[PDB]
Amino acid sequence: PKGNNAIPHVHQKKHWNPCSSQKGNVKVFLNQPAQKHRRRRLRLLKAKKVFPR
Amino acid sequence: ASIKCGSRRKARRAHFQAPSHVRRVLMSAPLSKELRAKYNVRAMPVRKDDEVIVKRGTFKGREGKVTACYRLKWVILIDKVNREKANGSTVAVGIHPSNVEITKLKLTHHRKSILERKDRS
Amino acid sequence: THYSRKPQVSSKSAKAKVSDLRCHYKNTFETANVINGMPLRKAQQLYRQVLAKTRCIPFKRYNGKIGRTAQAKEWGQTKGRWPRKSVVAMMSLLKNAEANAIEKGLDPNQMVIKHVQVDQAARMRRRTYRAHGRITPYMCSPCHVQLFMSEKKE
Amino acid sequence: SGMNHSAHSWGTGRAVARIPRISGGGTSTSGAGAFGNMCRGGRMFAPTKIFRRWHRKINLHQKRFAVVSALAASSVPSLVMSRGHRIDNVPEVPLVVEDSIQGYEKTKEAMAFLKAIAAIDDVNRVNDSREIRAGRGKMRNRRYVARRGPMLVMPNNKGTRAFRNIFGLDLANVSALNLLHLAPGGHVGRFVIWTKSAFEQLDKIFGTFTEASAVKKGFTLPAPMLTNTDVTRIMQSEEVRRVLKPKKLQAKKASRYQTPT
RNA sequence: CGUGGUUGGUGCAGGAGUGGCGAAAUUCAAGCGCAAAGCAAACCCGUUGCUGAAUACAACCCUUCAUGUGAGUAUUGAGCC
RNA sequence: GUUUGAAAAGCACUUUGGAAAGAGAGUGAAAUAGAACCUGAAGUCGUGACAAAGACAAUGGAAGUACCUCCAUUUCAACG
RNA sequence: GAAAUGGGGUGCCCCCACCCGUCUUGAAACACGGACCAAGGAGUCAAACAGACGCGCAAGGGAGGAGAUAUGGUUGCCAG
RNA sequence: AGAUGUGGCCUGGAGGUUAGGACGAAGCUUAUGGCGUGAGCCUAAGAUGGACCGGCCUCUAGUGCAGAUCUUGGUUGGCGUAGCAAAGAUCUAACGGAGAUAUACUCAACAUGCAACGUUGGAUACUGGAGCGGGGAAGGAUUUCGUGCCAACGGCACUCGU
RNA sequence: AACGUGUCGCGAUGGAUGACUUGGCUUCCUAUUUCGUUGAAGAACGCAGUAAAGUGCGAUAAGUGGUAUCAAUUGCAGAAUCAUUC
Ligand SMILES: NC[C@@H]1O[C@H](O[C@H]2[C@@H](O)[C@H](O[C@@H]3[C@@H](O)[C@H](N)C[C@H](N)[C@H]3O[C@H]3O[C@H](CO)[C@@H](O)[C@H](O)[C@H]3N)O[C@@H]2CO)[C@H](N)[C@@H](O)[C@@H]1O
Ligand SMILES: [Mg+2]
Ligand SMILES: [Mg+2]
Ligand SMILES: [Mg+2]
Ligand SMILES: [Mg+2]
Ligand SMILES: [Mg+2]
Ligand SMILES: [Mg+2]
Ligand SMILES: [Mg+2]
Ligand SMILES: [Mg+2]
């Protein structure tokens, strides 16, 4: 029985998750701390490359 | 060799799927303390025709000369360490080179070049 | 690893055993259970008489709509048969058990057959072809027989 | 996985259940059921996804008030002792040593420090408990388990080299204190060794009640809900026992002889 | 007057990358079924003290003659890195 | 999964059988670890020893009894 | 070297007792599913709101993305 | 039907703590009792096993089976049962073969070794030249041939064999 | 009686469970990281003293050359030297 719930509008009808038939359309941030580290490692490798400007 | 790492499944793969130049370093024996103290080297890869004494197993306290380093079976073959089959014919029994220390080295001028390389002095 | 029972005096008892006989289990069951109290020579006499069809093997457990015969009144039955392939494979085993008595030093004329046990071996797979395109099994069902026999004299 | 077959249901009219079954013939898997949580070689119920919630986010003040609470309980010697640590010979809790140990360069000299500050009874608790882990996890790069011994808090990142090799002693930096190590297991009261100048900058890091911290902007220590946490001394004080009800003479008890009823 | 190693040709020097190579200390001392085990109840006494309920077990019971403990990465005691 | 075992030491030899095998010996700590050989379940089956039992299909509940019990607990003397 | 209370095992007596699961007003059903066993086998994860309760701060609350340096470290711990 | 509570039980893993194990861990076994209302837990004995693992507090999930004409493996009653009935048919002696002519006495033989195999000879039949004749295509691809050989196959048999 | 039934001890059939795991799956990173008419990917047939499949290689065919390593390979055979290169 539906009650006093908000009218949902959840917008997930366009084959977004990878199931056995769908490649998916999905973007996950599991490499967020490793690209965080990569950009800093590559800014310290670049600050050496330009030195002393 | 650097077989031991963080991953057991990868470490235990690089041990049992090791080439025979890796299996030579892995199949090493300690030196006797009158011989460790001379060359200042603690352990040594086992060759054929160098003399050893066995330290673990039922054959502990047995001397003899290494007649085969059977690297595919991970074992060593001493002539004096053997038993007989049902026929009465004798067969050499394998020992791992952990259970064994070297009492005389078989020296060539490629083996005398490993001792100068592992010399701790 | 196979004998269910051991003899009382093992120095007066000869063993025999079949690995996988490839007779029928349900016929070597009754061929062999009938000699479980007999002497060696009275058990051998029975088998030469089942071959001559003068005495029969009583089928008491795996009988199930076999024909009833006039010779099963010896055993208090009504139905029995003459399974000649299970008979002559039990004669090869009684001859093994008495050869194993002679090399122990025993008289085979004094051996009472203690302990007959027949058990089912692993079955063997073939195939029969039924109607309408069906294929359905055609198994073999062989057996394991074991016996010792203990000497009872004087 | 479990779905890479071309299986279809045989429908109805054969005496077989209505599930998808492997197409083809000539093999032992042909005709076998597929595509369900109960078929073998089929797919699991609700197959797991990488977009599960793995990481959690905790409020910044509520992470600070949990690091402070586990750090307050290391000063209590009753809670450090009821958590496993063998602090029976330790001089004081909170133990504080000088900064000469941040220049040791041999592990044999760091081991004589723990023998002298009597924190070697908790390193020798961790060495004994080294065993092989029970279960599946030792196939999964988790072979050995030990206990958590003493934490050693340094003022900064240096001077660790004599202490890195001791099995059992944990190192820490006071500018970055982890709650995973100050209360491991969820249980407060880690034994901590606290060098001199890591202990003299612990008011700049966390502040006081009336004075904020320099490191953590705007963070004063949270106010105590009770000024005096000893609520049984209130229950037994002479000005609370003054206003209590007088304990009246109660009724005489029963007997082995029953009652008339 | 300077400059260009991204003008072409000739040369040469360091580095990185790559590949080989490269460390410490017990097979320490107890012997075998049974103490190669324990107790001394936070710590400390203790680098010390006294301690054997397997005079074991081996299948209905007792007796007679037999068999039976693989390898110490365990235990305990010293010493190390 | 080939994972027998620490190591093939993978059962020499004897005599029954045409052989498969069997009965002994032997190796090994273990062979009821003997070769797709660690563990060896349930279901099902054989065998030895027993308990019985009419036809109420069986199972089941309650309450006693008869016989059994490599089970537990308690008691052995001016004491339970 | 046994006695005594139990527990367990197998029968027996008198008594009581319809086959389980399911849909259904109603199943012991002449209503479906059901020979045995092992091993698998079905309310999960994410997203948006809501309410209950736990916790922090409160006219304020809290990020997120990203920087920064302990770490310009480390096989690893440390994707914290 | 349904809701809820449970310092309520159980399983895999993770963080902590506290302990077990070659003087025998997990697993398995049960006329092994104990105790819990119960889910269950624990002890004992294995004449079982042979190296790992328990308890408590938290965290986590591919976490509890009796049935879905449930999935996969195995087993079972039916059951030594239905059957192995078209295409006429085999008999004999000698050889071969382990396949016999196989017997505890005081027994002459029958009444206590039956059945079944191959080869050559002989007898008897059959196919009946739109052939169980002799060659080819398609299809097959060593089934051809000699020699050994009988585990499994040739739904009976085999000493024979595609 | 015989069949049958039940209970225990021992055997069989069966291949679960536990322990083990050179495998999968998932995530993250590092590059002078991206094939072919100079014949690629794929397909076929061969190659060992012994060799079916697989692996490796191509009539130089389970490999030739060079560097590093420093005494094997091994199921059984075969093999100058038993080792600063050769
Ligand atoms: N006999 C009754 C049945 O026993 C069965 O279990 C029995 C067996 O599984 C079990 O096995 C015995 C064991 O007791 C005994 N102590 C040692 C023996 N190795 C085991 O026997 C086992 O091994 C032998 C060969 O080794 C096999 O032939 C046999 O099939 C197998 N059960 O003994 C159990 C009885 O104590 C069932 N669990 C049960 O359904 C039923 O009660
Ligand atoms: Mg698909
Ligand atoms: Mg799958
Ligand atoms: Mg390190
Ligand atoms: Mg209703
Ligand atoms: Mg599930
Ligand atoms: Mg007929
Ligand atoms: Mg005619
Ligand atoms: Mg046939």
What is the DSSP annotation of D16-62?
A: S-SSEE---SSSTTTT-B-SSSSSTTSPPSS---TTS-------HHH
Query: Which nucleotide lies at the shortest CA–C1' distance from C61?
Result: I3
Q: Does A17 contact chain D (CB < 8 Å)? A: yes
CA of B81 vs C1' of E32, distance in Å? 24
- Nearest-Cα distance to chain B for D132, in Å, is 14
Q: List strand I contacts in B 13-42 (CB < 7 A).
A: 13, 16-17, 20-21, 23-24
C-alpha–C-alpha distance, residues C35 and C31, integer Å: 8
3-state helix, strand, coil in chain D (%, to 5): 25, 10, 70
- Nearest-Cα distance to chain D for B6, in Å, is 7
Give the Å distance between the CA of A14 and the centre of ligand 2. Answer: 19
DSSP state, C79?
Answer: B
Cross-chain residue pair A30–D43, CB shorter than 8 Å: no
**Residue among D209, D127, D202 at smallest CA distance from D172:** D202
Chain I nucleotides covered by protein, CB below 7 Å: 1-4, 9-14, 19-23, 25-30, 68-75, 82-85
User: How was this entry determined?
Assistant: cryo-EM
Residue to test with chain D: of B4, B5, B8, B13, most D Cβ within 10 A = B8
Q: Is the dihedral of CA C80, C84, C85, C89 positive or negative?
A: positive
CA D104 to chain centre: 31
Give the Å distance between the CA of C136 and the centre of ligand 7. Answer: 22
**Residue among A27, A20, A24 at smallest CA distance from D46:** A20
- Nearest-Cα distance to chain A for D42, in Å, is 12
- Determine whether the distance from the CB of A48 to the nearest atom of strand G is below 7 Å: yes
CA of D22 vs C1' of H107, distance in Å? 74
Task: Name the amino acid, one letter, at D7.
Answer: A
C-alpha–C-alpha distance, residues C24 and C81, integer Å: 13
CA of B100 vs C1' of E15, distance in Å? 46
Tell me the C-alpha to C-alpha distance, in Å, between residue D106 and each of D102, D121, D160.
11, 20, 10
Alpha carbon distance, N-terminus to C-terminus of chain B: 23
Burial class (CB in 10 A: 0-12, 13-18, 19+), D230: exposed
DSSP string, B53-110: EE-SSTTTT-EEEEEEEETTTTEEEEEEEEEE-TTS-EEEEEE-GGGEEESS----TT
Number of B–D residue contacts, CB under 8 Å:
6
Cross-chain residue pair B7–D143, CB shorter than 8 Å: no
CA of D188 vs C1' of H37, distance in Å? 39
* Cβ count within 10 A of residue D70: 23
CA of C9 vs C1' of F16, distance in Å? 22
- Determine whether the distance from the CB of B89 to the nearest atom of strand I is below 7 Å: no
Task: Name the amino acid, one letter, at D193.
Answer: I
**Residue among C40, C44, C46 at smallest CA distance from C150:** C40
* Cβ count within 10 A of residue B101: 19
Q: Are D45 and D3 in contact (CB under 8 A)?
A: no
- Nearest-Cα distance to chain D for B8, in Å, is 6
Only one residue has tokens 């009808």, namely A13
Q: Is D69 left (phi over 0), alpha (psi -120 to 50) or beta?
A: alpha
Q: What residues pair up with C136 in beta bridges, in sequence order?
A: C128
b/e code D163-182 from CB counts within 10 Å (16+ = b): beebebbbbbebeebebebb
DSSP string, D180-226: HHHSTTS-----B--BHHHHTTHHHHH--SSS-BTTTBT-PPPPPS-
Contacts of D3 in chain A (CB under 8 A): 20
Q: What residues pair up with B53 in beta bridges, in sequence order?
A: B63, B101
**Gap positions in chain D, given as the residue before each gap (C–N > 2.5 A)?**
none
Q: Does A34 contact chain D (CB < 8 Å)? A: no
